[PDB]
Design a binder for this molecule. Structure first.
Ligand SMILES: *[C@@H]1O[C@H](CO)[C@@H](O[C@@H]2O[C@H](CO)[C@@H](O[C@@H]3O[C@H](CO[C@H]4O[C@H](CO)[C@@H](O)[C@H](O)[C@@H]4O)[C@@H](O)[C@H](O[C@H]4O[C@H](CO)[C@@H](O)[C@H](O)[C@@H]4O)[C@@H]3O)[C@H](O)[C@H]2NC(C)=O)[C@H](O)[C@H]1NC(C)=O
Ligand SMILES: *[C@@H]1O[C@H](CO)[C@@H](O[C@@H]2O[C@H](CO)[C@@H](O[C@@H]3O[C@H](CO)[C@@H](O)[C@H](O)[C@@H]3O)[C@H](O)[C@H]2NC(C)=O)[C@H](O)[C@H]1NC(C)=O
Ligand SMILES: *[C@@H]1O[C@H](CO)[C@@H](O[C@@H]2O[C@H](CO)[C@@H](O[C@@H]3O[C@H](CO)[C@@H](O)[C@H](O)[C@@H]3O)[C@H](O)[C@H]2NC(C)=O)[C@H](O)[C@H]1NC(C)=O
Ligand SMILES: *[C@@H]1O[C@H](CO)[C@@H](O[C@@H]2O[C@H](CO)[C@@H](O)[C@H](O)[C@H]2NC(C)=O)[C@H](O)[C@H]1NC(C)=O
Ligand SMILES: *[C@@H]1O[C@H](CO)[C@@H](O[C@@H]2O[C@H](CO)[C@@H](O)[C@H](O)[C@H]2NC(C)=O)[C@H](O)[C@H]1NC(C)=O
Ligand SMILES: CN1[C@@H](CC(=O)c2ccccc2)CCC[C@H]1C[C@H](O)c1ccccc1
Ligand SMILES: CN1[C@@H](CC(=O)c2ccccc2)CCC[C@H]1C[C@H](O)c1ccccc1
Ligand SMILES: CN1[C@@H](CC(=O)c2ccccc2)CCC[C@H]1C[C@H](O)c1ccccc1
Ligand SMILES: CN1[C@@H](CC(=O)c2ccccc2)CCC[C@H]1C[C@H](O)c1ccccc1
Ligand SMILES: CN1[C@@H](CC(=O)c2ccccc2)CCC[C@H]1C[C@H](O)c1ccccc1
Ligand SMILES: O=C(NCCCO)c1cc(Br)c(Br)[nH]1
Ligand SMILES: O=C(NCCCO)c1cc(Br)c(Br)[nH]1
Ligand SMILES: O=C(NCCCO)c1cc(Br)c(Br)[nH]1
Ligand SMILES: O=C(NCCCO)c1cc(Br)c(Br)[nH]1
Ligand SMILES: O=C(NCCCO)c1cc(Br)c(Br)[nH]1
Ligand SMILES: O=C(NCCCO)c1cc(Br)c(Br)[nH]1
Ligand SMILES: O=C(NCCCO)c1cc(Br)c(Br)[nH]1
Ligand SMILES: O=C(NCCCO)c1cc(Br)c(Br)[nH]1
Ligand SMILES: O=C(NCCCO)c1cc(Br)c(Br)[nH]1
Ligand SMILES: O=C(NCCCO)c1cc(Br)c(Br)[nH]1
Lengths: 205, 205, 205, 205, 205
């Protein structure tokens, strides 16, 4: 569409994806949740879990807003995430890079709200010695910004999902809880928030 | 050809491959089909299937059309798919990224119709516990746009293929059916279409 | 050389490597041959062969010619293949992308004749159930353009090679024959050519 | 922030990340330390250790400083490490490239001090034949600049860490020492510094 | 340094890394040597050797020289090898691409002499059936330009190294010799030089 093309032309003009879109010392609030689509494997010897997780991230970037009357009909645009600022959220437990299974695209609406929903295949470290018991194994998946404290990037939780779990995998999901925290570290004056998912599962065997 | 060179020079001038080529709120219709060239492996423990599939996608991009009388002789051009908009179609069942086996080129004709026919090696999740039975295992391969609803991208089916199947693999293909759906999701007002291929196969023994 | 530098400066100026260098509806003739340097492995379970093959491709690109009297001393130049048009030749039997073992460079002479001789490590599909028999296994390696028909790209065969075969591998090469064909496909009006190498080999044990 | 955006615009203008930011023949001092987060595996046959290590590097780049009164509020910025000069520090014992697990971002303050803290998964060569003894196996992890001698890049040590070690891995960390050295090599007039970590560990079983 | 920054700015201005820096039909002399740091593995079944080798390459590029009085203090610069012309030297025996373990940087001095010293992990083909004998296995590692004959690129040998060999690997290095040759091939009028390293080794038991 013609108004879409003009809209994209304006991004490349003025926008720097390296700059976190804070304003007036207000943080950028990033909503974060997770759906555990699969447990692919559990390596009992090496204390590693292999999962597919669907992350849901959303935030407002004030630099991405436009006047709906100046680009009529254009309600949302699909945009390569590499051309936007994105949260530098890291899974602390990860022992390999993530493999992103989905197109690397974000949805952005007229008031600059961005939705980025990557599905990833990820291996991470966890004590899984309980996995063949009734109790199962319980792993923590701690997520947080690598470089931004609470006054720059305000990580916030949202309602999660057991409904995406693939029923035919050889592990059953006993449950998932989630918790947001602020911690300090000896380096830095300001607190860093994290959102941690506690996941309990066991072998169907 | 000299007219070919002038024709390509015009693409780089006006064209943004990030923008879906809708016009007048009309969707872009994308025709989608599949030929299952091979079942390479079936991992019974991890519930994974390894295939080579040949996808056939085609759509019209109105920005790619030209006057055949102004570029005489030039009936179709071979073009890197990376310089065109392409459908963000995803295999929902995939547990790894696809490996594209074919040149990343599309054919485009004078009225802007694009053919993109990648062959991919792909591993995906499926309940394969039936694979050593007469009934075999039946897997769904659901394909759909990750970011575009029906009013932007109208996914449509076409005539599929058993004729490419490699006869000497250790799995025999019992059959393939296909089905198009529109579904809604709790988020979004507009429906997303998918095309799903149901594939039944079994070990030869 | 100083004349070499001026010669390269002229490529970047006028040349588009995406455009097949046909002229006056005449095809570009591409000469194609192969030397099978090694059979690395044969996977009897998965019906896969692992080889190193040395391809020899050559064609004339009329846009790459220059006046030898205007660039004196410059008889041929070594050029990154990515900055030239190259044939989009594909091994139809391949089940993984190729791994190129050689510098990605082509030789080009003053009348625009290009030599490109990549050595590749490649795994491909083949019925190898005969490999521990006197008859051995016989595999077809079919090569062809993915996007260009006979009137654009005229694929032509040349004299091949058993002399590069590594004598100490655990497979012996019984023989190699080669054949050029034209086929039609239901889509397209024009025929596509291929060059197929039939390779027979067996386990030494 | 608006002052943040103007600040980044000035980097791209004047700055070359290939140039080591020495001044007045003074070296760039790079502070270096390590936290050994995990021993993932030990390959006794191939004499290889697989670890995750968290490196802490910091240096001053005089070209990155700014006036705090001219960019009010802007105390530190998060920046892609690829757009800054970075130390070419190498783990001498490495037998594969590193896999970086963290966002490739550095913190930079107003006086051009840069903090870069990558976590890496890395396999390296070590005599591990002692690993199931009380004494354990003792490995050297020698780190140093690949191309800069002491008068250009002054590598300096800092206080290290056993406290990050994951308690549930099947190896226990006995102890870590660290040592800085200057050596000469027959080639070169100037000495090269290194920082070496000696790490002792053993199988728990 | 300020003079360093101006020096780099001049490279990007005038220099093309695709052009071999011959002058007055004189070849570019490339000095080549090798230190075999490790034998990682020997695959007896597939006739493959896995090594880490440290290559030492040096040549003069007349386009890289500068006046020391015009860039005072600047004696050598560390430069990404991708921004310089480099020899297209190939290990003829290689069955996989190399993995470069070192920063991809070269040293260049004021008279345009370039030092490039990559350490690589490389698997290559060799008859290793002797590896469990007193005699051991003897492999040839033949290195040479892929596209340049002797009158363009004059490959020359230098004094090599057993002193880097890791003492704790399960193979002992019996010896390494080296030899330079000129050969002709039926295609081409001019001879191609190579430098071959003969390496003898055996399992320690
Ligand atoms: C951007 O970030 C950088 C790094 O954090 C900051 O630069 C540092 O600034 C601090 C504070 O000014 C410096 O700390 C001071 O350093 C003095 C010199 O230290 C060096 O030299 C001595 C030997 O003479 C060594 O022992 C020492 O390890 C260093 O090599 C010290 O003398 C100071 O110590 C005294 O004051 C402190 C504070 O009151 C007392 O607690 C001490 O007991 C002591 O009496 C002091 O530690 C530091 O050197 C700088 N680091 C670097 C790496 O350069 C920038 O300030 C920051 N920019 C902005 C705008 O904030
Ligand atoms: C650029 O390279 C090409 C390819 O190497 C050169 O063309 C080839 O030149 C050979 C040798 O001269 C030709 O063979 C000759 O054919 C005639 C009969 O037709 C015969 O009299 C000779 O004995 C010899 O066999 C060959 O046909 C030709 N091949 C192709 C594909 O064009 C070309 O000369 C080079 N250009 C320049 C400017 O050097
Ligand atoms: C940049 O580094 C290169 C390589 O170290 C330097 O070139 C080398 O310079 C030395 C001393 O000038 C040369 O030695 C001389 O060689 C000649 C001819 O063979 C001989 O007759 C003399 O007795 C003397 O030994 C050396 O050959 C030369 N090497 C190469 C490969 O060119 C260069 O000088 C350095 N430049 C600066 C400014 O540091
Ligand atoms: C852009 O998207 C956001 C998020 O979907 C919309 O903001 C929400 O608006 C609804 C009420 O209309 C409420 O759920 C919340 O108050 C908002 N959510 C958040 C996360 O801020 C916003 O309306 C959209 N803008 C437009 C113009 O459509
Ligand atoms: C470009 O290709 C498309 C698809 O092959 C052509 O559209 C078809 O036109 C024929 C008319 O003979 C119809 O019967 C088909 O049903 C059309 N298909 C679709 C999807 O539109 C188009 O005509 C071609 N353009 C040119 C100039 O040849
Ligand atoms: C179609 N898709 C979303 C696409 C979208 O709007 C989107 C994409 C990318 C970024 C931002 C938004 C909208 C909500 C449904 C979802 C698909 C399903 O939940 C799903 C996802 C992953 C595995 C299995 C099933
Ligand atoms: C030759 N090729 C197509 C090439 C083309 O025109 C094309 C390429 C790329 C984009 C658009 C069109 C046209 C239809 C036939 C096909 C070849 C065979 O079906 C095949 C496909 C996959 C594996 C094995 C064999
Ligand atoms: C030296 N080299 C070629 C290099 C060249 O001129 C060339 C390179 C790239 C493009 C165009 C031409 C020319 C023909 C001989 C060949 C060497 C041997 O046959 C060989 C090839 C592959 C594996 C093992 C041995
Ligand atoms: C939050 N994070 C650092 C982030 C930061 O300031 C930083 C990042 C990148 C560049 C420069 C600075 C500061 C120190 C604490 C650390 C987190 C924890 O110790 C940790 C590190 C590695 C693995 C597991 C856990
Ligand atoms: C410090 N380093 C070289 C670094 C340099 O100046 C250099 C780097 C890159 C390009 C040109 C020159 C110079 C010669 C010594 C070498 C280190 C040692 O041999 C070594 C190599 C590999 C494993 C263990 C030890
Ligand atoms: O340039 C953009 N917004 C500024 C408003 C100018 O009217 C913008 C945001 C997104 Br998402 C795109 Br595409 N462009
Ligand atoms: O590992 C992560 N960060 C590194 C990015 C590439 O260097 C990461 C990001 C997200 Br979202 C997850 Br889950 N992990
Ligand atoms: O997984 C797919 N897309 C990922 C994009 C890169 O992150 C994908 C596309 C198609 Br067609 C298939 Br099958 N999978
Ligand atoms: O720019 C193109 N066409 C529009 C102008 C008509 O003269 C165009 C289409 C394709 Br396909 C290429 Br390449 N360029
Ligand atoms: O798979 C092939 N082509 C895809 C595009 C580049 O990877 C291919 C080409 C050749 Br030659 C072989 Br063998 N495979
Ligand atoms: O510019 C080139 N050819 C056109 C002729 C201009 O007089 C050219 C061909 C090659 Br190969 C290079 Br490098 N440049
Ligand atoms: O095969 C080599 N080069 C191909 C192009 C770059 O990947 C090569 C060079 C050297 Br030195 C070795 Br060992 N292999
Ligand atoms: O440009 C920067 N600093 C110089 C000040 C000129 O106004 C600079 C440093 C960093 Br980190 C960024 Br982003 N910009
Ligand atoms: O610019 C450079 N040399 C061209 C001649 C001007 O004196 C040059 C060489 C190297 Br290494 C760099 Br960085 N720049
Ligand atoms: O090998 C290293 N550097 C080369 C650049 C590409 O990997 C390296 C750096 C560090 Br820190 C480690 Br550990 N390895």
């Amino acid at each position: 569409g013609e108004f879409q093309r003009k809209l994209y032309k304006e991004l490349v003009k003025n926008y720097n994806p390296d700059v976190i879109p804070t304003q007036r010392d207000r943080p950028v609030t990033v909503y974060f949740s997770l759906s555990l689509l699969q447990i692919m494997d559990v390596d009992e010897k090496n204390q590693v879990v292999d999962v597919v997780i669907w992350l849901q991230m959303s935030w407002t970037d004030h630099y991405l807003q436009w006047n709906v009357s100046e680009y009529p009909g254009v309600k949302q645009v699909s945009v390569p995430i590499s051309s936007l600022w994105k949260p530098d959220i890291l899974l602390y437990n990860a022992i390999e890079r993530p493999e992103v299974l989905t197109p690397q695209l974000a949805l952005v609406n007229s008031s600059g709200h961005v939705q980025y929903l990557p599905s990833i295949r990820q291996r991470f470290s966890c004590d899984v010695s309980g996995v063949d018991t009734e109790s199962g194994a319980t792993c923590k998946l701690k997520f947080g910004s690598w470089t931004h404290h609470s006054r720059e990037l305000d990580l916030q939780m949202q309602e999660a999902d057991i409904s995406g779990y693939i029923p035919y995998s050889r592990f059953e999901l006993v449950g998932v809880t989630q918790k947001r925290s602020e911690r300090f570290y000896e380096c830095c004056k300001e607190p860093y928030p994290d959102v941690t998912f506690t996941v309990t599962f066991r072998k169907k065997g």
